[PDB]
Amino acid sequence: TETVGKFEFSRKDLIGHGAFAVVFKGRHREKHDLEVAVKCINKKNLAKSQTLLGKEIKILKELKHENIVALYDFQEMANSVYLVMEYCNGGDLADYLHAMRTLSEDTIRLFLQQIAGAMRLLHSKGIIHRDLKPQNILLSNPANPNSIRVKIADFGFARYLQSNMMAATLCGSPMYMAPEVIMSQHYDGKADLWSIGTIVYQCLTGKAPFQASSPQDLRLFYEKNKTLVPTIPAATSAPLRQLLLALLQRNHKDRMDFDEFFHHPFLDA
Ligand SMILES: O=C(NCCCNc1nc(Nc2cccc(CN3CCOCC3)c2)ncc1C1CC1)C1CCC1
Numbered sequence: 637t638e639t640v641g642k643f644e645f646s647r648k649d650l651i652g653h654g655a656f657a658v659v660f661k662g663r664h665r666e667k668h669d670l671e672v673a674v675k676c677i678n679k680k681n682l683a684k685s686q687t688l689l690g691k692e693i694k695i696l697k698e699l700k701h702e703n704i705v706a707l708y709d710f711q712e713m714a715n716s717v718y719l720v721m722e723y724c725n726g727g728d729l730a731d732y733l734h735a736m737r738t739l740s741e742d743t744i745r746l747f748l749q750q751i752a753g754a755m756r757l758l759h760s761k762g763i764i765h766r767d768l769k770p771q772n773i774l775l776s777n778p779a780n781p782n783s784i785r786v787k788i789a790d791f792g793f794a795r796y797l798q799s800n801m802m803a804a805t806l807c808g809s810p811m812y813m814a815p816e817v818i819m820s821q822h823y824d825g826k827a828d829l830w831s832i833g834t835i836v837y838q839c840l841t842g843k844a845p846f847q848a849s850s851p852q853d854l855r856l857f858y859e860k861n862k863t864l865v866p867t868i869p870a871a872t873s874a875p876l877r878q879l880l881l882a883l884l885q886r887n888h889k890d891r892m893d894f895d896e897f898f899h900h901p902f903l904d905a
């Protein structure tokens with residue numbers, strides 16, 4: 637049982653890991669029933685892990701939204717970094733999908749409405765996330781689909797991007813990267829919309845819209861195919877079909893923009 641401020645956690649209770657972080661369940665040292673997630677360095681990549689946790693603090697401390705994982709506290713020092721975040725009792729969307737295989741359109745709508753709410757804030761603040769994928773989408777139960785709250789997590793790759801500028805850093809998860817990202821081209825906040833389209837497609841079908849055996853294979857596929865058209869099942873509602881075809885466009889200038897996404901009829905209640 638280690639401590640960080642007025643919080644504690646145990647390294648026995650690993651609830652997530654990536655190349656640049658590990659996350660442990662914990663709680664407030666005084667209100668033991670207030671659970672938290674404590675994100676720590678991954679020591680197999682000490683220097684980059686430390687950098688990325690530092691970056692995440694700077695972003696997340698500016699974002700307060702019911703559909704973004706809350707930062708309760710943090711502690712940054714020369715040789716160590718911890719973030720103390722909201723614990724989401726439903727775990728990640730990746731494990732939920734693995735169990736459920738596919739989600740109903742009604743549940744996709746409820747989840748995507750919340751993702752869209754979070755993206756509204758990011759877009760107004762001029763922040764791009766750059767690593768949206770089911771592993772980084774969290775669920776919390778307060779019960780049914782209509783009560784699951786979803787939260788975007790893992791802002792270590794996120795950056796401010798001025799509205800007249802483009803980003804060029806190669807980062808993210810290849811199977812969810814927009815084509816312009818994985819092909820080492822400039823990109824903007826519409827790269828996140830491709831990622832979101834990919835998540836939605838995966839929720840609907842249980843599979844990736846563009847199958848590949850490796851990252852390099854996927855890049856070659858994008859380079860060689862100047863038009864990208866996902867297969868849409870016949871059972872798909874006409875609004876969800878249109879939304880998926882709008883988000884999963886190869887070329888960012890053609891892709892759905894934020895205003896189109898936020899107002900798309902699929903998201904109407
Ligand atoms: O944060 C990441 N991935 C998401 C999973 C780990 N993180 C979290 N897990 C959780 N919750 C959680 C994760 C896995 C399992 C569970 C417990 N449930 C048990 C019952 O059935 C559902 C899962 C809960 N809440 C918040 C967080 C994030 C840091 C603020 C990345 C891994 C390096 C960063």
Ligand SMILES: [Mg+2]
Binds near residue numbers: 790791792793
């Ligand atoms: Mg990020």
Ligand SMILES: [Mg+2]
Binds near residue numbers: 814816824
């Ligand atoms: Mg772009």
